[PDB]
Curated annotation (Swiss-Prot), chain B:
Species of provenance: Escherichia coli O45:K1 (strain S88 / ExPEC)
Gene name in the database record: rpsK
Keywords, alphabetical: Ribonucleoprotein, Ribosomal protein, RNA-binding, rRNA-binding
Family, similarity comment: Belongs to the universal ribosomal protein uS11 family.
Protein name in the entry: Small ribosomal subunit protein uS11
Keyword Cytoplasm carried by entry: no
Transmembrane segments: none
GO terms of molecular function: rRNA binding; structural constituent of ribosome
Gene Ontology CC entries for this record: ribonucleoprotein complex; ribosome
Job description of the protein: Located on the platform of the 30S subunit, it bridges several disparate RNA helices of the 16S rRNA. Forms part of the Shine-Dalgarno cleft in the 70S ribosome.
Gene3D superfamilies given in the database record: Ribosomal protein S11
Length: 65, 116, 151, 65
RNA sequence: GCUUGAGUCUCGUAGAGGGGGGUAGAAUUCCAGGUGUAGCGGUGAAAUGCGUAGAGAUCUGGAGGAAUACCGGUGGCGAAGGCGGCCCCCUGGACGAAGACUGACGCUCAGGUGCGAAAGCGUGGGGAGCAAACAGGAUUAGAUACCCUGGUAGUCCACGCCGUAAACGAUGUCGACUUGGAGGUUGUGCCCUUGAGGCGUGGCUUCCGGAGCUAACGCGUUAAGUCGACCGCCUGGGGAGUACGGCCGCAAGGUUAAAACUCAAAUGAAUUGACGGGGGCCCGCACAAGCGGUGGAGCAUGUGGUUUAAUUCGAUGCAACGCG
RNA sequence: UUGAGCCUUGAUGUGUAGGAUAGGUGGGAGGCUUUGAAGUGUGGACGCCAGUCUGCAUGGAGCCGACCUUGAAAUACCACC
RNA sequence: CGCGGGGUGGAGCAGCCUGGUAGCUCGUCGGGCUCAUAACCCGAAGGUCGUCGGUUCAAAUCCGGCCCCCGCAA
RNA sequence: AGGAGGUAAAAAUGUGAAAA
């Protein structure tokens, strides 16, 4: 929204956007709602997040290491 | 020309072009910038390099105008977005302010549906 | 060709003085395996470079190499969506061999007088930065640099 | 992950200027409960005070004026 | 007749519950000036569209209609459809600790009745954007196709009407009953409010899974577990949820609902292969880097083609062509 | 105010030869030198990107005309263009 | 009659105010990317640049006159 | 490593009869 710094900037140096969105809300909430499907795409990646959660608990077995 | 100190350059950065005429907060508009008029058609229209060569050719002969530092008001994504005005800072012409006004509504009127 | 690893091997030298890089230049112009013939003529090519310079062996050849020796390499690299030419660095394994392969290719054309008299031209075409070794190299340095976006 | 109503009774109102601006950010966003760890019923009250003070002009609807 | 069923009041809990009325800023954006250079534009690339009167672009000024970014969450409320900024108004239903009150008034339900996404339709408004029907440029062996620039009806509010859906957690409603783990969760009991709580209570909800059950998948205290109340529905597939008739509707159609004939299969779950322009990884000159060339051209062999009494024949997608 | 006509004039003119991006004609031979040079910092009118020219100037007072390859002279000078 | 313009492989369209190239595509031939067909990529036949004449190193182009046509008024 | 940004041209057919 604003990246100025005003005295010592001299370059862009914009990782504020790279750590937040950088194209996020502009390239997604520009159009195309559809009002029906995304929640499943939300939940499937949330199931992947659940799978990311489930795989972190099953780390400690032996692993030969 | 007019020989002033600073100015307010408003950049309408479209998905294809960082359109900016060297403007002011009073409407004084002199120096254009175009991502298609700087050549670079084909795949090169939405390329960052189209904007950067156009932005140096935007600040062309502006030393005679008196203007060195210019208030960038970038609006939209823009093909360059981080080098268009930065090479101008790398060349030396610093920025008084970069106000990246993202025109975010509260989701009012219905938006189109291109790319079916 | 995914994990090819080996140390660099050896080649045949020059029996006049101790020079490995200049002897590597000999093997490139050595074609069809008739090495002895052009090796005698790369010696006369060294002679005819010694008249347009008058300095030395590996200083006349060095000036005939430093105005030709590259630093960068052309390669088509995508960021994922589209292809474009980028100026990327060349490794010195190819670079040392790159410049010497060029003056050989510079003399493979222009076959007006003998091999000495052709490389008379190509070494001074190289010594004064006016050769096909470098003019074609000037095109690569201008086509890659004019479209640098990412590294 | 803070002191809440069970222990830290607190009026979530748009009158108290301090706590009202403690859950906002410069990018035009009320900070969600996913990181701050607030309680949900009070988060709805936390949600309401922003819309309330937006009418009072303590906080705008945008950030650039 | 009492009371654990059920029901009422009390008192607090939360909420896009319903509708009606204002409001505000942003946002594509039209009415134009300022000032201003040649493109804007779009993608696979190009282009019709579009601008030199000065568009894109530029900031200040003016006009709106229609929706509410973050909050927002497998979150809440409602029977479901479905409902989301703010604010007050009339108004829905549920929950909760604990009391007083009538004392089985209940549970389900053919018919009937109401509500009932969107689209469509009727009269009238309203129209900014989006976009059917409709125009064009190209990619194309075809374009009534993606991609691309315009645009009407519709979307719109009010009153009507239709009464269809993957109206679906594909599981009817009611109540009893049967190991748990781990999230979300709001009223709420005790203890040290000592401190981010300890210890529970229940409404409701999410996921993995126990016995059991299930064709299997999986469901799994919100069951598809164990039983009971009662309504509705199916009897192989196509024909067909159509025909005809009744009924309802302005119409579009909805609705109740076959038979003749035809076939001996239709299907569902799960298993092993094959393929995918399904996603990832390892890897052979495949690509990468150069070197040398078949192909050109002058000649030889081989086979086909074209001729001949024979110009044998077998090999002839990859594995035939200096092959036998 | 603009698009033309015409002024005092302001520039500009490469098969090929080339110190020279020379339109023909044309003539005599020094222009030039403090009514302040032969060089260059730098924007840039010219453009067939081949190349000189004008103003300012720390400096500061030098130079070539014919003579030469060219069908033609060398924006040294030059009448009409 | 006169302000103008147009004649270009078998046909269609740029080259013309700037001379140095006689070209862009259709139908025609084959060679290959596919396993076969198709979409596709290259080298080319063939035009008296309307004719004659004149300057120039050289002529489609820059000019003279004539044959043949089309937009308009005598 | 939890969050993130970033990602690729049109490509069609092969009608029959062969399960100890």
């Amino acid at each position: 929204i604003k990246v100025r710094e005003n005295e010592p900037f001299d370059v862009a140096l914009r990782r504020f956007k790279r750590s937040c969105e950088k194209a996020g809300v502009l390239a997604e909430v520009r159009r195309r709602e559809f009002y029906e499907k995304p929640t499943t795409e939300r939940k499937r990646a949330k199931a992947s997040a659940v799978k990311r959660h489930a795989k972190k608990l099953a780390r400690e077995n032996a692993r030969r290491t | 020309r007019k020989q002033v100190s600073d100015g307010v350059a408003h950049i309408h950065a479209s998905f294809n072009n960082t359109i900016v005429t060297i403007t002011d907060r009073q409407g004084n508009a002199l120096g254009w910038a175009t991502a298609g008029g700087s050549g670079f058609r084909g795949s090169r229209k939405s390329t960052p390099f189209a904007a950067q060569v156009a932005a140096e050719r935007c600040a062309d002969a502006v030393k005679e105008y008196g203007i060195k530092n210019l208030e960038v008001m970038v609006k939209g994504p823009g093909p360059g977005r981080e080098s268009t005005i930065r090479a101008l800072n790398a060349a030396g012409f610093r920025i008084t302010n970069i106000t990246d006004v993202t025109p975010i509504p509260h989701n009012g009127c219905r938006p189109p549906k291109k790319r079916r | 060709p995914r994990r090819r690893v080996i140390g660099q091997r050896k080649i045949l030298p020059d029996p006049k003085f101790g020079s490995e890089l200049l002897a590597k230049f000999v093997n490139i112009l050595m074609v069809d395996g008739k090495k002895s013939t052009a090796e005698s003529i790369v010696y006369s090519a060294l002679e005819t470079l010694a008249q347009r310079s008058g300095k030395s062996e590996l200083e006349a050849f060095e000036v005939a190499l430093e105005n030709v020796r590259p630093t960068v390499e052309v390669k088509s690299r995508r960021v994922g969506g589209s292809t474009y030419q980028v100026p990327v660095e060349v490794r010195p394994v190819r670079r040392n061999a790159l410049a010497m392969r060029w003056i050989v290719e510079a003399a493979r054309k222009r076959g007006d007088k003998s091999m000495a008299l052709r490389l008379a031209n190509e070494l001074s075409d190289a010594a004064e930065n006016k050769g096909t070794a470098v003019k074609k190299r000037e095109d690569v340095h201008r086509m890659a640099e004019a479209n640098k976006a990412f590294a | 992950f803070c002191r809440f109503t069970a222990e830290g009774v607190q009026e979530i109102d748009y009158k108290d200027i301090a706590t009202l601006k403690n859950y906002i950010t410069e990018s035009g966003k009320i900070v969600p409960s996913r990181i701050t760890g607030t309680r949900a019923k009070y988060q709805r009250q936390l949600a309401r005070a922003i819309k309330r003070a937006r009418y009072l002009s303590l906080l705008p609807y945008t950030d650039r004026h």
